[PDB]
Amino acid sequence: GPGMLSILLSASSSYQTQTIGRLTTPGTNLVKAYKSSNPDLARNCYWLYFDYYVHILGYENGFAHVRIGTEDCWISKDSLEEITIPTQSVTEANIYSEPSRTGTIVRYVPANSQVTILDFNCDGFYRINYRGYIGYILEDALQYKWKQIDGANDGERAANLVKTKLGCKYILGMSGPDTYDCSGLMQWAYNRLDIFMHRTADVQDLHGQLIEDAQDILPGDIITFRTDSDNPMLVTHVGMYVGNGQFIHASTNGYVVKYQDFYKYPYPVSTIRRYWTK
């Protein structure tokens, strides 16, 4: 106020200067992703998709180095656009040199100031520009919220996110904003929480915290299923638990994003995976 800093913040930060990107994938819905700026172009690690949000770490050799949560990769720089977000502050704060409790003061910001968000989810801070002064301001000092404040954890936030897509049409290979397949809905929802998961159900099945007992399932957990009787050992489907014994999924049965009764669903579970941590 403005000097008070919580002991819960680290006294040190390795957070690198980043900007915000939105994928535009011109002319299509996807872009190949690589693990270097000089890749074996035949061996892309995966793809990223239209209207996904990323952090931009930099550019090299015609590629953008992008980040979603703990995952980073390289995509053609023409597949995304840089984003800045105008907002205002609601409480006096300092712009600090870094997102920690030992940064130097770049600029005092009075309450009600017009600012521009340049990066988000910076370990409890936004990176902003105020009157040309650039640095890190505590998240709660700004009006804009990059994710929901409501919810006890990111799992509940993920459940709300898939609920916002109820009624969207099923289309194989899509991940929003208007059409989805089962695994694209999962990846999209966690993209909006700055959490990376892979694109296909059979890989989503292999990461995240394993919830061994279904009694311990919570909103935002994903459930993978084996639904192909001609390949009965292969994971082919996925949905998100949203509480009260229901999960939401994009299904060809109805060709729509819809609720489904978990225990009445007539296909075997593979794993229950928790990709949220807070």
Author numbering: -2 to 275
Task: Quote what the paper states about this structure.
We report that T. vaginalis has acquired, by lateral gene transfer from bacteria, genes encoding peptidoglycan hydrolases of the NlpC/P60 family. NlpC_A1 and NlpC_A2 consist of the C-terminal NlpC/P60 domain preceded by two bacterial SH3 domains. The NlpC/P60 domain adopts the classical papain-like fold, with a central β-sheet of 5 strands displaying an antiparallel arrangement. Hence, we concluded that NlpC_A1 and NlpC_A2 are dl-endopeptidases with specificity for the tetrapeptides in peptidoglycan and with greater activity toward monomeric muropeptides.
The structures of NlpC_A1 T. vaginalis AG_119910 (TVAG_119910) and NlpC_A2 (TVAG_457240) were determined by X-ray crystallography. The similarity to other NlpC proteins allows us to assign the active-site residues of Cys179-His234-His246, present in all TvNlpC/P60 sequences. The active-site cysteine is located at the N terminus of helix α3, while the two histidines are in strands β15 and β16. The active-site residues sit in a “T”-shaped groove that is bounded by strands β14 and β15 in the NlpC domain, with the cross of the T formed by the β3 strand in the first SH3b domain. A surface electrostatic calculation demonstrated that the slightly positively charged active-site groove carries two pronounced areas of strong positive charge. The first of the two areas is adjacent to the catalytic cysteine, and the second is at the base of a small pocket at the interface between the NlpC domain and the first SH3b domain bounded by the residues His195, Tyr43, Trp44, Tyr46, Phe193, and Gln184. As expected, mutation of the catalytic Cys179 to either Ser or Ala in NlpC_A1 and NlpC_A2 completely abolished their activity toward PG.
